Design a protein around this motif. Structure first.
Motif, PDB file in Angstrom:
ATOM      1  N   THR A 120       0.827  -1.200   0.000  1.00  0.00           N
ATOM      2  CA  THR A 120       0.000   0.000   0.000  1.00  0.00           C
ATOM      3  C   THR A 120       0.863   1.252   0.000  1.00  0.00           C
ATOM      4  OG1 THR A 120      -1.483  -1.317   1.381  1.00  0.00           O
ATOM      5  CG2 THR A 120      -2.062   0.992   1.007  1.00  0.00           C
ATOM      6  N   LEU A 121       1.904   1.273   0.832  1.00  0.00           N
ATOM      7  CA  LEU A 121       2.822   2.406   0.837  1.00  0.00           C
ATOM      8  C   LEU A 121       3.604   2.533  -0.463  1.00  0.00           C
ATOM      9  CD1 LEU A 121       3.190   4.425   3.196  1.00  0.00           C
ATOM     10  CD2 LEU A 121       2.053   2.302   3.859  1.00  0.00           C
ATOM     11  N   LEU A 122       3.863   1.423  -1.154  1.00  0.00           N
ATOM     12  CA  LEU A 122       4.632   1.475  -2.390  1.00  0.00           C
ATOM     13  C   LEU A 122       3.872   2.150  -3.523  1.00  0.00           C
ATOM     14  CD1 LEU A 122       6.535  -1.937  -2.575  1.00  0.00           C
ATOM     15  CD2 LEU A 122       7.507   0.363  -2.512  1.00  0.00           C
ATOM     16  N   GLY A 123       2.574   2.377  -3.362  1.00  0.00           N
ATOM     17  CA  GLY A 123       1.770   2.993  -4.395  1.00  0.00           C
ATOM     18  C   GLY A 123       1.152   2.043  -5.396  1.00  0.00           C
ATOM     19  N   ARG A 124       1.173   0.741  -5.130  1.00  0.00           N
ATOM     20  CA  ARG A 124       0.576  -0.243  -6.019  1.00  0.00           C
ATOM     21  C   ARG A 124      -0.928  -0.312  -5.789  1.00  0.00           C
ATOM     22  NH1 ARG A 124       4.037  -5.745  -5.544  1.00  0.00           N
ATOM     23  NH2 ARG A 124       4.201  -5.093  -3.357  1.00  0.00           N
ATOM     24  N   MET A 125      -1.676  -0.493  -6.872  1.00  0.00           N
ATOM     25  CA  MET A 125      -3.125  -0.578  -6.767  1.00  0.00           C
ATOM     26  C   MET A 125      -3.522  -1.830  -5.990  1.00  0.00           C
ATOM     27  SD  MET A 125      -5.971   0.936  -7.432  1.00  0.00           S
ATOM     28  CE  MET A 125      -5.617   2.104  -8.740  1.00  0.00           C
ATOM     29  N   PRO A 126      -4.339  -1.706  -4.951  1.00  0.00           N
ATOM     30  CA  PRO A 126      -4.743  -2.880  -4.173  1.00  0.00           C
ATOM     31  C   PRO A 126      -5.812  -3.691  -4.894  1.00  0.00           C
ATOM     32  CG  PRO A 126      -5.798  -0.936  -3.302  1.00  0.00           C
ATOM     33  CD  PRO A 126      -4.852  -0.455  -4.369  1.00  0.00           C
ATOM     34  N   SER A 127      -6.075  -4.875  -4.347  1.00  0.00           N
ATOM     35  CA  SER A 127      -7.105  -5.759  -4.864  1.00  0.00           C
ATOM     36  C   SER A 127      -8.438  -5.465  -4.178  1.00  0.00           C
ATOM     37  CB  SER A 127      -6.698  -7.218  -4.677  1.00  0.00           C
ATOM     38  OG  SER A 127      -6.880  -7.625  -3.333  1.00  0.00           O
ATOM     39  N   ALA A 128      -9.420  -6.342  -4.405  1.00  0.00           N
ATOM     40  CA  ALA A 128     -10.763  -6.109  -3.882  1.00  0.00           C
ATOM     41  C   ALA A 128     -10.779  -6.137  -2.358  1.00  0.00           C
ATOM     42  CB  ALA A 128     -11.732  -7.148  -4.446  1.00  0.00           C
ATOM     43  N   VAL A 129     -10.242  -7.203  -1.762  1.00  0.00           N
ATOM     44  CA  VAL A 129     -10.254  -7.343  -0.312  1.00  0.00           C
ATOM     45  C   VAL A 129      -9.311  -6.363   0.368  1.00  0.00           C
ATOM     46  CG1 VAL A 129     -10.104  -9.063   1.545  1.00  0.00           C
ATOM     47  CG2 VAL A 129     -10.752  -9.764  -0.770  1.00  0.00           C
ATOM     48  N   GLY A 130      -8.399  -5.753  -0.386  1.00  0.00           N
ATOM     49  CA  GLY A 130      -7.371  -4.908   0.173  1.00  0.00           C
ATOM     50  C   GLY A 130      -6.001  -5.543   0.243  1.00  0.00           C
ATOM     51  N   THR A 142     -14.177 -17.219   4.411  1.00  0.00           N
ATOM     52  CA  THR A 142     -14.321 -16.711   3.052  1.00  0.00           C
ATOM     53  C   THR A 142     -13.123 -15.861   2.643  1.00  0.00           C
ATOM     54  OG1 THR A 142     -16.694 -16.657   3.518  1.00  0.00           O
ATOM     55  CG2 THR A 142     -15.967 -15.624   1.480  1.00  0.00           C
ATOM     56  N   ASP A 143     -12.283 -15.481   3.597  1.00  0.00           N
ATOM     57  CA  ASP A 143     -11.094 -14.705   3.286  1.00  0.00           C
ATOM     58  C   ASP A 143     -10.195 -15.509   2.348  1.00  0.00           C
ATOM     59  OD1 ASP A 143      -8.958 -12.971   3.238  1.00  0.00           O
ATOM     60  OD2 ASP A 143      -8.572 -13.010   5.382  1.00  0.00           O
ATOM     61  N   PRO A 144      -9.792 -14.951   1.203  1.00  0.00           N
ATOM     62  CA  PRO A 144      -8.944 -15.719   0.278  1.00  0.00           C
ATOM     63  C   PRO A 144      -7.601 -16.133   0.852  1.00  0.00           C
ATOM     64  CG  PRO A 144      -9.113 -13.414  -0.393  1.00  0.00           C
ATOM     65  CD  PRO A 144     -10.167 -13.643   0.642  1.00  0.00           C
ATOM     66  N   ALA A 145      -7.075 -15.424   1.850  1.00  0.00           N
ATOM     67  CA  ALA A 145      -5.758 -15.782   2.373  1.00  0.00           C
ATOM     68  C   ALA A 145      -5.729 -17.168   3.011  1.00  0.00           C
ATOM     69  CB  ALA A 145      -5.266 -14.695   3.338  1.00  0.00           C
ATOM     70  N   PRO A 146      -6.615 -17.522   3.954  1.00  0.00           N
ATOM     71  CA  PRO A 146      -6.605 -18.912   4.443  1.00  0.00           C
ATOM     72  C   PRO A 146      -6.883 -19.934   3.354  1.00  0.00           C
ATOM     73  CG  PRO A 146      -7.770 -17.495   5.969  1.00  0.00           C
ATOM     74  CD  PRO A 146      -7.554 -16.691   4.728  1.00  0.00           C
ATOM     75  N   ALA A 147      -7.754 -19.600   2.400  1.00  0.00           N
ATOM     76  CA  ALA A 147      -8.074 -20.540   1.330  1.00  0.00           C
ATOM     77  C   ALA A 147      -6.852 -20.836   0.471  1.00  0.00           C
ATOM     78  CB  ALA A 147      -9.214 -19.993   0.474  1.00  0.00           C
ATOM     79  N   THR A 148      -6.068 -19.808   0.144  1.00  0.00           N
ATOM     80  CA  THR A 148      -4.878 -20.027  -0.669  1.00  0.00           C
ATOM     81  C   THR A 148      -3.744 -20.640   0.140  1.00  0.00           C
ATOM     82  OG1 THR A 148      -3.393 -19.002  -2.283  1.00  0.00           O
ATOM     83  CG2 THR A 148      -3.886 -17.747  -0.294  1.00  0.00           C
ATOM     84  N   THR A 149      -3.713 -20.420   1.457  1.00  0.00           N
ATOM     85  CA  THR A 149      -2.713 -21.099   2.273  1.00  0.00           C
ATOM     86  C   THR A 149      -3.048 -22.565   2.527  1.00  0.00           C
ATOM     87  OG1 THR A 149      -3.747 -20.367   4.343  1.00  0.00           O
ATOM     88  CG2 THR A 149      -2.048 -18.951   3.382  1.00  0.00           C
ATOM     89  N   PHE A 150      -4.318 -22.961   2.395  1.00  0.00           N
ATOM     90  CA  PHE A 150      -4.682 -24.372   2.518  1.00  0.00           C
ATOM     91  C   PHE A 150      -4.171 -25.216   1.359  1.00  0.00           C
ATOM     92  CE2 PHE A 150      -7.638 -27.920   1.788  1.00  0.00           C
ATOM     93  CZ  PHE A 150      -7.525 -28.572   3.007  1.00  0.00           C
ATOM     94  N   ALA A 151      -4.089 -24.636   0.162  1.00  0.00           N
ATOM     95  CA  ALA A 151      -3.767 -25.425  -1.018  1.00  0.00           C
ATOM     96  C   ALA A 151      -2.401 -26.078  -0.917  1.00  0.00           C
ATOM     97  CB  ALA A 151      -3.829 -24.555  -2.269  1.00  0.00           C
ATOM     98  N   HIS A 152      -1.520 -25.554  -0.071  1.00  0.00           N
ATOM     99  CA  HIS A 152      -0.198 -26.118   0.130  1.00  0.00           C
ATOM    100  C   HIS A 152      -0.176 -27.174   1.224  1.00  0.00           C
ATOM    101  CE1 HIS A 152       1.110 -22.976  -2.531  1.00  0.00           C
ATOM    102  NE2 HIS A 152       0.742 -22.029  -1.687  1.00  0.00           N
TER     103      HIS A 152
END
Ligand code: ATP
Ligand code: ATP
Ligand code: MG
Ligand code: MG
Lengths: 48, 50, 464, 199, 93, 146, 464
Positions: free
Chosen positions: G261-271, G309-319
């Motif tokens: 966020t500080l780097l100036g990159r456009m965030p995603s939907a969830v932030g 429903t948070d994508p972060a736990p969902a994507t960390t489960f795949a591993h």
């Protein structure tokens, strides 16, 4: 001025009737001032 | 306790004229050496004796 | 010292000035419109500096008809209003010019509307309980002299009726100088209040000034400050207790949001001002009772879209001591004093200040109402057949009491055509204790609609 | 000897006066102090007051004196910081809060600890206060504050109206330090009472 | 003890009155003495002499460095080329 | 009485002790301001989160540093600020005084009493931002707090 | 040659270099800060090129006390940390400085932090039945050696106690080396862990590293990488079984979100920062057991607001292949293990390599729990009296099973005075078969809570 700063210094004088005396010099960002009004303001602002 | 509060208020209504009694002579004697203070102030503000 | 207008858009206007002189913040500027049909002068207010000797400003009047290059003059002073003893008995506008008699004034004292809140050592807590003929008010949340009173609610739930009823009570029982103001009102209400005050023969001692719907937002932001200024002038110089009334404070905040959108500031959550807490805090703290000056206020606040999560009432919650609330469901039930007992709260209520019987009765009433609310979910589907009698008794008691909280105030004289009533607090507490005891359970329910006292209760019950 | 420091942020001066009056009636003003930042002031004081209180506490902390700290509110500081950041043209974040706000809270709450016997027997405790709306926890500010605390107590208005004056919910409240802090007689007399109440 | 506290409070009020009176007399007498006594024409020269002496006696100081990087380099190169090319410049050339 | 005489003597001692001296420091100019914030031009010897002074007696703190501008926030009163002022750096990170005399009194966040009487005898002043103790400097917790 | 600093704000710093002086990505840079009270040595790592020899990066230390015009020097290398056998029994920060001894660890050989993933051609799945003493893990989700097992849950569920008990039980019976890394945790927990490990002799056999929350987010990006570097150095060379334990992984995702966020990159939907899954995959692959080397990784994942429903736990489960999660409702019930059997699952539970006895054990318990969840609200509202005979007996059986699953742990000694207990696998199988076939329906409700073993159950039955 040549003593404090090795480089030669030009002079541009401005008449200031507001001040009660003294002299003010500005060589750029730095500044030096001896003024009756400034000194009395400093004296009164620290009275308490 | 109400009696003690009332007597404290009485002491307050004594002090509230005691300070004025002291301040009468305070303001009478304030200007005893005000000119000397001004002279010292001038000597310091000018850097030399007045 | 001549200014020139360079760029205009909406109510916000820019100005440029000679490098030698630039006006200080919060200074009034005078302009003109050269058009014939729309000939009018404008008063502009300094907002902020943008460098290059540029100043942003807000118009006090509609901005149509302006053309570039028009000269702008400065008076080197803030906005000032007239103050004096003979002010009361007249209606005023935003700028202070008299309305009923044009040109009146201009010889009284003149004071600015920007000042500083009083210091810390001059404030003092107040606990004087203030009574009222209404029973629901002094039963749950008694009012305190010198504090603040809040009337929260939705839209069209009779806030104005309560306001005029309370002002009627206060004017009739007590005198004293009074000041009324208001923002976001309809002109019909203004005419009705003026006529009623003229009838009451008390309008002479009441100061009146108010804006309306169709005005530029600057007036909607400055009228409250002007009214508070004149109230402070009455409080300080005269050394007299002052009654104050304001209406629909919420609109004020809304106005600010609009002008912020025009200034270009970064928006905040839900599209509000980047800063809103400071202005609310400074406006609230300006009202303060000194040791030698007691001031009683009562503000009506609006709630948008029937939602309580919005920041507008959320910030106001922190500046209040005595609060009452309204609900749509209770109004839909039928009782007109739709005041939620479970949600209303107060700070004066304490056994150290109030009698033990009052505290105990209030606690028991709250417990009964809370229990009924808890069981409302289950009773909604099945009913009373499955419910045991041990709870049927409390259900009947709760229904009877919540119907007894209704009242017939005088304010309905023009709607139902029936006179109102007033009740002393001792009668109220004794009657409520009797009702909580369960002695009245045999009486029919419909006898408790719109009744004044227990004697009228018995007469109505025996009449059917 | 315990020295306590109370901090108030953005409250009506009358409330501070009433609290001071009640405390004076208590008569503890021989060993306490108050830091006042009324809501009428500018954003700087509201943003800076907790740091001043923390430094005042730390000075006695290094000397070996036990210190207690209480924060009146914490959401007001976050609001002031958000307003400042939005004014200074910084990019916004999740519902318009700056990203780094969480870090700030850490730098405020990591100071409280207990010194080793080499540097003295000083101690320091804090009781931050958080306000919530409609008993909602989904807002991320309470979530962020919870994760950096050793224990919390939940309070609800329903229990208040039921009749329980403390109105603390034992179902959710928990402390990670456990009974090692409380006296041994308490541990012997009372044990697993929270469990028994839960069943 | 609280009454003694207010006693010290009224002592502080006396101190406040003292401060106000001292400030008033100080500002008035200083302003009059500097606008009347030292307003003599020779006082300006005396003040200038004292200021010159003060600026003389002070210790020396260090001063240096009297807009894009590529623009600065290009300007320097152009100046060097001008200096190397203007050798044959004439009065009218 | 003699207490007021001694107060006047101390005032004169301050009078017989005032000696303003010229010093070397840099200045700046307020390009623009508003809403409690302001911008400063020049003044190249500033420090991150360093305190600076203003002509009216208010104080400011430098938050961010652009390559040719300095954004600062006004702490106290801000309606006495206009373009063209003079600013002076203090050459010191923000600090707060501390002392045992602070007990039983109410102060503003800067450290000046607002409701109390007199003044505070502060032995030392310490920086606001410091470093927390490390794990090697800590110890377990066992004492109760009733 | 060196450059200068032009813009300073927050942690992000951008610098300028002359011609032929720009370094590549991810190089250590030293900045010198001087002050009377704050003297430090800022260490920075390159982030991105902005062109014209203007490079933006972040800092490993807070940026208080900085001044523009300060030179920045380049070492022409990436981050490196010393490793070796003498590292055991010592504490280090992200930069690798020894906390216990300031001068220690300045002579060992150094390796670059960044590495390359292992070749796919040397990948083989690992199957093994490693058994612990706890009933739930033994029966529900058996662990596998050389694989990944992760923990899940919201705030304050008690997973730290679980990991402490696990490490205490396993490290004693282990001859390999263990490395512990804490990305984010309170100082008190780390100090207590250090004291506890010092209380035993196993501390010499392990290595420790962690970072606290008060540090800037830059230090929270490399601690996991340093731990992985140490682990790979041990595994690839020594050829010995190693233990890598991770407290959490959510914290560095947070710090990445804020730094992006500080780097100036456009965030995603969830932030969340974009390409977060890329960083996830880059980090997770480093933990891999080849055909000749075995490594075990323990980690617990914090979920925000217990929302799946948070994508972060969902994507960390795949591993993950074998997982165990925790719930708050079962904790509120009173059970301390608080493991949900309906959603927990493994990848090695099958009749193929394990006896089908376990299989129909699991099927019986799972179907019982599912129908119990189906009938829960019915028994809550309608009442137990309306259920059928089979349903009543099944509900009693499900209550027996639910009460029996809890078990004390020795790590609860400081919280509860009752000492913990351990039970083998075959006896648990027999006891569960006895319970699920329906012979222990005569025991009271309390007789099944907090039970060591079957003989403990008999003793407590004789106690009532
Ligand atoms: N006690 C009452 N007796 C008769 N009518 C009542 C009573 N209380 C409420 N009402 C009715 O409810 C409505 C309230 O109208 P009113 O204009 O006072 O609403 P308000 O909520 O104050 O207005 P606003 O829309 O500005 O919020 C009217 O229809 C009025 O007749
Ligand atoms: N078997 C047990 N017996 C008693 N108390 C227990 C048991 N297991 C855990 N607890 C309690 O749970 C808490 C342990 O907190 P822990 O650090 O393990 O939680 P966590 O889920 O990692 O949460 P967070 O990261 O939010 O701190 C303590 O309050 C401890 O008393
Ligand atoms: Mg209305
Ligand atoms: Mg845990």
């Amino acid at each position: 001025l040549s003593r404090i700063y090795g480089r030669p210094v030009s002079v541009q004088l401005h008449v200031d009737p507001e001040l009660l005396g003294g002299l003010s010099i500005t060589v750029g960002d730095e500044v030096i001032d001896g003024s009756i009004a400034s000194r009395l303001a400093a004296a009164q602002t620290g009275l308490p | 306790r109400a009696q003690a509060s009332g007597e404290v208020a009485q002491t307050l209504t004594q002090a509230d004229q005691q300070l004025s009694a002291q301040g009468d002579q305070v303001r009478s004697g304030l200007e005893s050496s005000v000119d000397g203070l001004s002279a010292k102030l001038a000597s310091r503000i000018l850097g030399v004796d007045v | 010292t001549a200014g020139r207008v360079v760029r205009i858009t909406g109510p916000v206007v820019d100005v440029e000035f000679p490098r030698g002189s630039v006006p200080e913040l919060f200074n009034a500027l005078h302009a003109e419109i050269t058009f014939g049909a729309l000939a009018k002068t404008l008063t502009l207010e300094v907002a902020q500096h943008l460098g290059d000797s540029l100043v942003r400003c807000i118009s006090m009047q509609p901005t149509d008809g302006l053309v570039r290059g028009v000269e702008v003059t400065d008076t080197g002073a803030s906005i000032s209003v007239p103050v004096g003893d003979g002010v009361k008995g007249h209606v005023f506008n935003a700028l202070g010019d008299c309305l009923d008699d044009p040109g009146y004034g201009k010889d009284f004292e003149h004071w600015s509307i920007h000042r500083k809140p009083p210091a810390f050592s001059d404030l003092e807590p107040r606990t004087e309980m203030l009574e009222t003929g209404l029973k629901v008010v002094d039963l749950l949340t008694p009012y305190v002299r010198g504090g603040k009173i809040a009337l929260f609610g939705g839209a069209g739930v009779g806030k104005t009726v309560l306001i005029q009823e309370m002002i009627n009570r206060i004017a009739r029982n007590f005198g004293g100088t009074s000041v009324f103001a208001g923002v976001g009102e309809r002109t019909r209400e203004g005419n009705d209040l003026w006529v009623e005050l003229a009838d009451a023969n008390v309008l002479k001692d009441t100061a009146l000034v108010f804006g309306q719907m169709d005005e530029p937002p600057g007036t909607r932001m400055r009228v409250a400050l002007s009214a508070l200024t004149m109230a402070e002038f009455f409080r300080d110089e005269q050394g007299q207790d002052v009654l104050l009334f304001i209406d629909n404070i919420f609109r004020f905040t809304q106005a600010g949001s609009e002008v912020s959108t025009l200034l270009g500031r970064m928006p905040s959550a839900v599209g509000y001002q980047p800063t809103l807490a400071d202005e609310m805090g400074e406006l609230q703290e300006r009202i303060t009772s000194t040791r030698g000056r007691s001031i009683t206020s009562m503000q009506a606040v609006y709630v948008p879209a029937d939602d309580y999560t919005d920041p507008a009432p959320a910030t106001t919650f922190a500046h209040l001591d005595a609060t009452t609330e309204l609900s749509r469901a209770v109004f839909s039930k039928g009782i007109f004093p739709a005041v939620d007992p479970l949600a209303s709260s107060s700070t004066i209520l304490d056994p150290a200040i109030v009698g033990d019987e009052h505290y105990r009765v209030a606690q028991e009433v709250i417990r009964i109402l809370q229990r009924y609310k808890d069981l409302q979910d289950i009773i909604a589907i099945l009913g009373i057949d499955e419910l045991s009698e041990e709870d049927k008794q409390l259900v009947n008691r709760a229904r009877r009491i919540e119907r007894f909280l209704s009242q017939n105030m005088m304010a309905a004289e023009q709607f139902t055509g029936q006179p109102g009533s007033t009740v002393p607090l001792k009668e109220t507490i004794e009657a409520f204790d009797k009702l909580t005891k369960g002695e009245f359970d045999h009486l029919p329910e419909q006898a408790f609609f719109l009744i004044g006292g227990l004697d009228d209760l018995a007469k109505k019950a025996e009449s059917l | 000897q315990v020295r306590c420091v109370y901090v108030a942020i953005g409250q009506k001066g009358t409330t501070i006066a009433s609290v001071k009056r009640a405390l004076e009636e208590g008569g503890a003003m021989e060993y306490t102090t108050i830091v006042a930042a009324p809501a009428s002031d500018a954003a700087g004081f509201k943003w800076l007051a907790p740091y001043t209180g923390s430094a005042i506490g730390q000075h006695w902390m290094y000397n070996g004196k036990h210190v207690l700290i209480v924060f009146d509110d914490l959401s007001k500081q976050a609001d002031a910081y958000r307003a400042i950041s939005l004014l200074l043209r910084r990019p916004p974040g999740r519902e318009a809060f700056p990203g780094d706000v969480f870090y700030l809270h850490s730098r405020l709450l990591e100071r409280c600890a207990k010194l080793s016997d080499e540097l003295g027997g000083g101690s320091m405790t804090g009781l931050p206060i958080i306000e919530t709306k409609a008993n909602d926890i989904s807002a991320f500010i309470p979530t962020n504050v919870i994760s950096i605390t050793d224990g919390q107590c939940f309070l609800e208005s329903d229990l208040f109206n039921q009749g329980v004056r403390p109105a603390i919910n034992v179902g959710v409240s928990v402390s990670r330090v456990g009974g090692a802090a409380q006296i041994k007689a308490m541990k012997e007399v009372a044990g697993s009472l929270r469990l028994d109440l839960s069943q | 003890a609280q009454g003694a506290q207010q006693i010290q409070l009224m002592r502080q009020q006396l101190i406040r009155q003292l401060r106000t009176g001292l400030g008033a007399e100080a500002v008035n007498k200083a302003a009059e003495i500097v606008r009347a006594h030292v307003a003599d024409p020779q006082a300006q020269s005396a003040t200038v002499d004292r200021f010159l002496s003060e600026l003389e006696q002070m210790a020396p100081s260090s001063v240096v460095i009297d807009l894009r990087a590529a623009s600065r380099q290009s300007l320097a190169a152009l100046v060097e080329k001008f200096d190397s090319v203007a050798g044959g410049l004439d009065a009218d050339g | 009485t003699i207490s007021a005489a001694d107060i006047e003597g101390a005032i004169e001692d301050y009078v017989s002790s005032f000696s303003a001296d010229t010093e070397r420091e840099e200045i700046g100019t307020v390009i623009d301001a508003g809403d409690g914030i302001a911008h400063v031009e020049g003044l190249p010897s500033v420090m991150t989160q360093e305190l600076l002074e203003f002509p009216g007696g208010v104080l400011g703190v430098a938050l961010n540093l652009d390559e040719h501008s300095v954004g600062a926030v006004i702490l106290g009163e801000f309606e006495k600020i206009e373009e063209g002022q003079q600013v002076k750096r203090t050459g010191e990170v923000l600090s707060v005084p501390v002392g045992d005399a602070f007990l039983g009194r109410v102060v503003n966040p800067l450290g000046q009493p607002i409701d109390g009487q007199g003044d505070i005898a502060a032995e030392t002043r310490r920086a606001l931002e410091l470093q927390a103790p490390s794990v090697v400097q800590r110890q377990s917790v066992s004492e109760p707090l009733q």
